[PDB]
Design a protein around this ligand. Structure first.
Ligand SMILES: [Mg+2]
Ligand SMILES: [Mg+2]
Ligand SMILES: [Mg+2]
Ligand SMILES: [Mg+2]
Ligand SMILES: [Mg+2]
Ligand SMILES: [Mg+2]
Ligand SMILES: [Mg+2]
Ligand SMILES: [Mg+2]
Ligand SMILES: [Mg+2]
Ligand SMILES: [Mg+2]
Ligand SMILES: [Mg+2]
Ligand SMILES: [Mg+2]
Lengths: 52, 154, 118, 176, 138, 326
RNA sequence: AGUAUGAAAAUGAUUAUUUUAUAAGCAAUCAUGAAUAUAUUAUAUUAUAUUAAUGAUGUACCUUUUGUAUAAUGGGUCAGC
RNA sequence: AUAAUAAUAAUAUGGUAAUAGAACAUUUAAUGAUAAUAUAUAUUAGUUAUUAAUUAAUAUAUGUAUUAAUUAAAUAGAGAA
C-alpha cells in the first residue's frame, strides 16, 4: 500500500486507487441529486406560474 | 466514403447452375450501364442470362423505389457465390468404377452505383492522382542508392 | 600546418574513428554505432580524440590522430536501443530439428553537436 | 595562395574498373598534413563559401584574397548560348519619342499587317522592345487567346499530359 | 522576381540543448498475483526513490491494476514502449526499467550493412560528375 | 442522506478554482509534472514553479454559448474559469515578440542579402505556430483532456491539474469525424504555441538583469538549433533578367551564358554545362538536359550565390542594398 | 444426426492497391528504386505496411541410406482425431 | 561460506544415433482476490532476446475467469503411418 509520500522525491507519485465501481456509484448519486434539484426547481416554477 | 455513395444491392435466388458457367457471362457485364447489361442478357443465348436479367430488373426497380433513376445506374460489381447444399450422387461407371456427380446451385449478387456521384468521384480522384504525378526529368535526381561506407569516393 | 582554408569555410566534414570504425559526419548528423556503450550514458557528451580527416569542399586536413588542439568535434549520446528482432532458422537437409538463432543486437545513437576548427 | 600537395580521391584498387567499391578508399591512407582536393563536382545547387565567386563576396571578407573559387574554364573559348543580338552587339537607344508614338499608333491600327517582327525590321529594334512600348488592340489579343484555346482542345490526351510534365520540369529547374 | 516556397525546420535533439527522450514511466502492479511479486518488491525497496533522485527529468507513476505487472514508458517523440514484467524478480525489473530509460522512443527497425550515419545536410563536397572529374574516362 | 455528494464535488471545484486563481507556490512545488518539465529544459532556478504553472494557463474567462450546443458539436467541460490577472496572455505576447526579434536577427546574421519574402518564409519556418506546437509536444506539455467531474471522481490533487496545460478545449470535437470550426482560442496547437512563448517570456523576466543574453542562448539551443536549408526556400520567375539587373547595379560586366561542356546532344537525355561569365569571373555554373534549361539553371545558381552569401563572424557586419527589382 | 453461435482454414467469384506482354528455373532471403495506404508530435528531407522494377544469393520437405535436387519412400489442400 | 543482478580475465558453446539438464503452450483438481473503465476470443499495428506474454485500436460475446501463482496430474503439442 504505497503513497506518494513514501517515495521521498517529487517526481515519484502514486495515482489513487479508487475502485471504478465506487466512482461510478458516486457519479450516479451526483446525477440523482442534480435531478432532484433542477426538477424540483422546475416544478416550483410551474406552481408559481399556475398561481399567477 | 465508399459505403455512403448511393448504391443498390440486388440478389438472385438459388440458381441451378455452376459458378464457372455464371461467371462466364458475368465477366461480360463488368462496368456496364444497367440497361445495356439487361439488353445484353436478353440476347445472350445462355440459360443463366435470363435469371441475371431478371435480377438486374429487380435492382433497377429497387433503385427507382428508393431514389435513383434507371439511366444513372451502372453495374459497379457483380459476382457469383456458391449457394448452400449441393447434393452429391454416385455415378456408376463400367467395371467397378465409381464417380461422384454433384449438382451445383449458385447465386448472383450485384451492386449498382450511380454514374452521377460515384463514377464522377473516381474520375476526380484519378485526375488528382495525375496532377500529383511527378514529371519524367531527363537528369532527375535519382538517389545514389547504397551505403556510403564512411568514406568519400569523390 | 596552415589550417586557414578549413577555418574560413562554412561547411565542414570529419571522419572520426570509434574503435577503428570510420564514420564520416557533419554537424547535426546522427551516428548509429553498432554496439552498446558502457562508458557513456544518455545525455553524456563525447569529445572525439581520433579524427582521421577534416575536410572542406576543396581542402582536407589529414593524419593519424590529428591534434585535438586543431579542432573541436563533440557528440552527445541520445539513445541506447536495439535493432529489430529476428529469428533466422538453422537446420540441415534431412533432419527435423531446427535451431532458432535469435538476434537483437544493440545500438548506441550519437548526435554530432559541435564540429568546428579551434 | 597555398602551396599544398593536391590529390585525387584515391583508391588502392583500379579506379577504372572498381570506383564504386568503398573498401579500397578506406584502405588508402595518405601522409599526415594538409591537402588540396578539387571537388569532382559541379557547383550548381551549392551555397558553399568555396563555391561563391569573388565578385559576390564583400570587399573585406578574407576569402576574396584566397584562391578556391578557381577559374578553371576560360571565357574566350566557350560559345555564346541562347543569347540576344543586343548582347553580341551593344544595346541601342536611337529611337525617339515621335517614332515610338507612331509605332504605337500602327500597333493600335493593324496588328496582322504591322506585327512585332515587321516593326522590328522597320526600326532596327527588338520585338521585345516593341512589345514593351506598345499594346495591340485588345480584340486581337482575345482572338489569339481563342485560337490558343482551340489548339489546346485539339490536343490528344497524351500530349496534354506531356505538356503538363514539361511545365512541371520547367518549374523545378528554377529551384536549385 | 523571387518567390518564397514555404517549409519548416527539422528538430535536431542534441545540437543545441538536449531534451531527455524518456518523460514518464508508469510502474504498474497488482497486490494479488504471484506474477507481480518482483514488481511489488521493487516498489517496496527504496530503489524507486534512488532512481527518482538520479533522474528528475522523468516522472514515475505508480498504478494498481488487476493484471500482470507492467512498465509502460512514454517518450518525447510520442511513442510508448510497454514491457510486461511477468514473474520477474527485483533486479530483472530494475534492468528492464534501465533499458526503457536508455532507449529513445523510436520504433525498432532492421539496419543494413554499414548504414551508420543519418544526415539531412547536403554533401559538403558535391555529388560526383563525369564532366567535372579530375580524371576523364579514357 | 448521510452523504451530500453534490456538495463535496462543489467544494472540490471551488478549491480547484481558488488554486488556479492563486497558483500557490507550495502546490506548484508538490506537482511532479511541472518539476519534471523544469528539469528537462534546464531552466534557471530563479524561475519559480508558480510561474511555470501560469505559463501553462491560457486565458479562459467566461464559458461561451457554443457550450450549450453539444447537440450541435461542441462541449467544454474540462476547463475552470481562470484569473484575469494571472493568465499566460501577457507573457505570450512578449515571448512572440522575442521570437520575432531574435530569430530574425539570427537569420540576418547568417544570410545578409536574403530577399525579404524568403527571409519571412524562413522566419515562419523557424517559429510558425505548428512548429511551436510540435516543440511543446516534444517538451511534454500535455493538455487537460479530463473533465473536472472525472478528476474529482478519480480523487486526484490540484497539483496534477496545475501541471497540465489549461485552455478551453472542446471535449468531443473530433468524434464521428465531425469537427466544429471555431476561432484560434480553442485550438490545441495555438495553445501549445502560446505556452512555449510564455515559457520564453518567463525566462526573460527572470534573467533580465543577472544575465541578459541567457534567454537568447536558450532560444538558440532550442529554436535556432533546428535545421532549415535556405536553398530550398527560393523560386525564381525569369532569373536571367534579375541577374543582369544585379550585374548592372554592381560593378560587373554584362553576364553572358556560354557552353563549357556538352554530351549526348541528339538524345533522350543530353547534358549541357553552361557557365554565366562576367568577363572572366564565372558567376554561375548550370547543367541541363536542354541548352535553355542549362542557361536558366546557371542564372538561378548565380542568384543563389548572390543571396545566400554567409559571411564570417570575423567580418564587419555586412548590409545588403536590399533585393534586386525588375 | 442435440440447440444456439461461427471474421477457422482449405475452396469460388468480385473489387481495390501494386507489379506484370524481350522474359527461363523450390517462387524465398538479402540488397534496392518506384508506386500506393495508414498514422490527433509527418516539425520533415517523417515512420510503418503493402507491392515479382532491378541486382545478388538460393537443387522443396520427410523417410531410408555409404550416399538423394534426385528420375528412391510418402503426402491433392485444409480442419478434427 | 547464500541468493539475485552487474563487472573484469580466461576457457567453452556444429551435430545424426544417443545421454544429461531447464523451460513454455493446452486441459483437468486443490488454494484463490478482482470486475461491463471488466473479461474471453479474434484482426491489425506496436513492446519484451519473443513456440510466449503483453500494449493500443477495432469486432463479438459474457453480469463475468478453475483468472495470477504454487502444487498435483494428464486422452499435454502433428506436414509426414
Ligand atoms: Mg451455412
Ligand atoms: Mg458409362
Ligand atoms: Mg468433382
Ligand atoms: Mg543424411
Ligand atoms: Mg529441416
Ligand atoms: Mg573487378
Ligand atoms: Mg546433393
Ligand atoms: Mg504420390
Ligand atoms: Mg551443442
Ligand atoms: Mg494426443
Ligand atoms: Mg492438423
Ligand atoms: Mg512442424
Amino acid at each position: 500500500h504505497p503513497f506518494s509520500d513514501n517515495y521521498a522525491s517529487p517526481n515519484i507519485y502514486v495515482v489513487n486507487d479508487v475502485t471504478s465501481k465506487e466512482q461510478k456509484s458516486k457519479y450516479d448519486t451526483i446525477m440523482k441529486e442534480i435531478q432532484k434539484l433542477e426538477d424540483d426547481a422546475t416544478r416550483k416554477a410551474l406552481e408559481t406560474a399556475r398561481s399567477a | 466514403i465508399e459505403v455512403l455513395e448511393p448504391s443498390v444491392y440486388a440478389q438472385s435466388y438459388r440458381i441451378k447452375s455452376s459458378m464457372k458457367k455464371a461467371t462466364l457471362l458475368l465477366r461480360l457485364l463488368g462496368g456496364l450501364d444497367v440497361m445495356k447489361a439487361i439488353s445484353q442478357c436478353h440476347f445472350s443465348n445462355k440459360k443463366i442470362a435470363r435469371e441475371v436479367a431478371e435480377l438486374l430488373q429487380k435492382g433497377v426497380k429497387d433503385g427507382q423505389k428508393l431514389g435513383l433513376k434507371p439511366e444513372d445506374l451502372y453495374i459497379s460489381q457483380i459476382w457469383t457465390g456458391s449457394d448452400g447444399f449441393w447434393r452429391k450422387r454416385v455415378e456408376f461407371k463400367a467395371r467397378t468404377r465409381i464417380g461422384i456427380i454433384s449438382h451445383p446451385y449458385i447465386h448472383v449478387r450485384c451492386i449498382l452505383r450511380t454514374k452521377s456521384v460515384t463514377k464522377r468521384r473516381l474520375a476526380y480522384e484519378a485526375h488528382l492522382k495525375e496532377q500529383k504525378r511527378a514529371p519524367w526529368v531527363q537528369l532527375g535526381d535519382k538517389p545514389i542508392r547504397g551505403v556510403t561506407g564512411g568514406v568519400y569516393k569523390w | 600546418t596552415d589550417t586557414t582554408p578549413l577555418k574560413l569555410s562554412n561547411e565542414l566534414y570529419a571522419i572520426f574513428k570509434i574503435h577503428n570504425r570510420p564514420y564520416l559526419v557533419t554537424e547535426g548528423d546522427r551516428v548509429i554505432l553498432p554496439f552498446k556503450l558502457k562508458q557513456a550514458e544518455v545525455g553524456d557528451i563525447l569529445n572525439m580524440t581520433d579524427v582521421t580527416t577534416l575536410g572542406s569542399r576543396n581542402y582536407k586536413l589529414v593524419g593519424h590522430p590529428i591534434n585535438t588542439s586543431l579542432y573541436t568535434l563533440k557528440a552527445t549520446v541520445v539513445g541506447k536501443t536495439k535493432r529489430a528482432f529476428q529469428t533466422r532458422e538453422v537446420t540441415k537437409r534431412r533432419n527435423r530439428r531446427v535451431r532458432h538463432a535469435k538476434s537483437k543486437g544493440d545500438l548506441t545513437i550519437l548526435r554530432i553537436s559541435e564540429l568546428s576548427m579551434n | 595562395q597555398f602551396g599544398f600537395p593536391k590529390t585525387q580521391v584515391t583508391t588502392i584498387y583500379n579506379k577504372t574498373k572498381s570506383a564504386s567499391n568503398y573498401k579500397g578508399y578506406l584502405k588508402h591512407r595518405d601522409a599526415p598534413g594538409m591537402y588540396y582536393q578539387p571537388s569532382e563536382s559541379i557547383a550548381t545547387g551549392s551555397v558553399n563559401s568555396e563555391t561563391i565567386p569573388r565578385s559576390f563576396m564583400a570587399a573585406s571578407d578574407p576569402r576574396r584574397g584566397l584562391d578556391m573559387p578557381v577559374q578553371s574554364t576560360k571565357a574566350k573559348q566557350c560559345p555564346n548560348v541562347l543569347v540576344g543580338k543586343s548582347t553580341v552587339n551593344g544595346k541601342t537607344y536611337h529611337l525617339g519619342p515621335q517614332e515610338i508614338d507612331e509605332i504605337r499608333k500602327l500597333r493600335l491600327d493593324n496588328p496582322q499587317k504591322y506585327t512585332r517582327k515587321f516593326l522590328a525590321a522597320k526600326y532596327g529594334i527588338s520585338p521585345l522592345f516593341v512589345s514593351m512600348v506598345s499594346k495591340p488592340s485588345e480584340q486581337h489579343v482575345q482572338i489569339m487567346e481563342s485560337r490558343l484555346q482551340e489548339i489546346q482542345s485539339r490536343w490528344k490526351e497524351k500530349r496534354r499530359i506531356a505538356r503538363e510534365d514539361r511545365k512541371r520540369r520547367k518549374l523545378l529547374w528554377y529551384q536549385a | 522576381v523571387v518567390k518564397a516556397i514555404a517549409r519548416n525546420s527539422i528538430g535536431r535533439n542534441g545540437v543545441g540543448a538536449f531534451v531527455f527522450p524518456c518523460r514518464k514511466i508508469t510502474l504498474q502492479f497488482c497486490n494479488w498475483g504471484g506474477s507481480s511479486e518482483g514488481m511489488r518488491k521493487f516498489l517496496t525497496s527504496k530503489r524507486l526513490d534512488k532512481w527518482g533522485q538520479e533522474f528528475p527529468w522523468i516522472q514515475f507513476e505508480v498504478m494498481r491494476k488487476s493484471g500482470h505487472p507492467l512498465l509502460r514508458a512514454e517518450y518525447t517523440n510520442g511513442r510508448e514502449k510497454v514491457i510486461c514484467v511477468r514473474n520477474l524478480n527485483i533486479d530483472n525489473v530494475e534492468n528492464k526499467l534501465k533499458l526503457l530509460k536508455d532507449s529513445d522512443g523510436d520504433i525498432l527497425r532492421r539496419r543494413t550493412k554499414n548504414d551508420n550515419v543519418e544526415s539531412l545536410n547536403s554533401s559538403v563536397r558535391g555529388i560526383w560528375s563525369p564532366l567535372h572529374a579530375a580524371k576523364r574516362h579514357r | 442522506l448521510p452523504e451530500s455528494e453534490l456538495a463535496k464535488y462543489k467544494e472540490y471545484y471551488q478549491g480547484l478554482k481558488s488554486t488556479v486563481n492563486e497558483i500557490p507556490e507550495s502546490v506548484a512545488s508538490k506537482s511532479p509534472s511541472l518539476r519534471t518539465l523544469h528539469k528537462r529544459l534546464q531552466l534557471p532556478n530563479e524561475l519559480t514553479y508558480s510561474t511555470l504553472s501560469r505559463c501553462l494557463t491560457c486565458p479562459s474567462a467566461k464559458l461561451p454559448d457554443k457550450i450549450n450546443n453539444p447537440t450541435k458539436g461542441a462541449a467544454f467541460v474540462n476547463t475552470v474559469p481562470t484569473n484575469k490577472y494571472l493568465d499566460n496572455h501577457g507573457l505570450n505576447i512578449m515571448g512572440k515578440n522575442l521570437l520575432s526579434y531574435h530569430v530574425t536577427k539570427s537569420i540576418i546574421q547568417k544570410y545578409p542579402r536574403l530577399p525579404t519574402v524568403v527571409l519571412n518564409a524562413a522566419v515562419n519556418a523557424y517559429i510558425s505556430e505548428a512548429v511551436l506546437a510540435h516543440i511543446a509536444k516534444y517538451w511534454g506539455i500535455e493538455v487537460e483532456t479530463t473533465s473536472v467531474l472525472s478528476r474529482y471522481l478519480k480523487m486526484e490533487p490540484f497539483e496534477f491539474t496545475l501541471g497540465r496545460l489549461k485552455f478551453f478545449n472542446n471535449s468531443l470535437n473530433s468524434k464521428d469525424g465531425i469537427e466544429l470550426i471555431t476561432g484560434k482560442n480553442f485550438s490545441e496547437t495555438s495553445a501549445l504555441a502560446m505556452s512555449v512563448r510564455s515559457i520564453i517570456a518567463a525566462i526573460w523576466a527572470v534573467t533580465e538583469q543577472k544575465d541578459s543574453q541567457a534567454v537568447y542562448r536558450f532560444i538558440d539551443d532550442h529554436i535556432m538549433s533546428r535545421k532549415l536549408d535556405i536553398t530550398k526556400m527560393f523560386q525564381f520567375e525569369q532569373p536571367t533578367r534579375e541577374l543582369a539587373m544585379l550585374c548592372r547595379r554592381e560593378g560587373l560586366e554584362k553576364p553572358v551564358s556560354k557552353l563549357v561542356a556538352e554530351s549526348g546532344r541528339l538524345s533522350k537525355s543530353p547534358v549541357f554545362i553552361v557557365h554565366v561569365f562576367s568577363g572572366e569571373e564565372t558567376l554561375g555554373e548550370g547543367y541541363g538536359s536542354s541548352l535553355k534549361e542549362a542557361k536558366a539553371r546557371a542564372a538561378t545558381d548565380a542568384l543563389m550565390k548572390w543571396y545566400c552569401y554567409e559571411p564570417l563572424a570575423q567580418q564587419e557586419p555586412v548590409i545588403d542594398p536590399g533585393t534586386v527589382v525588375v
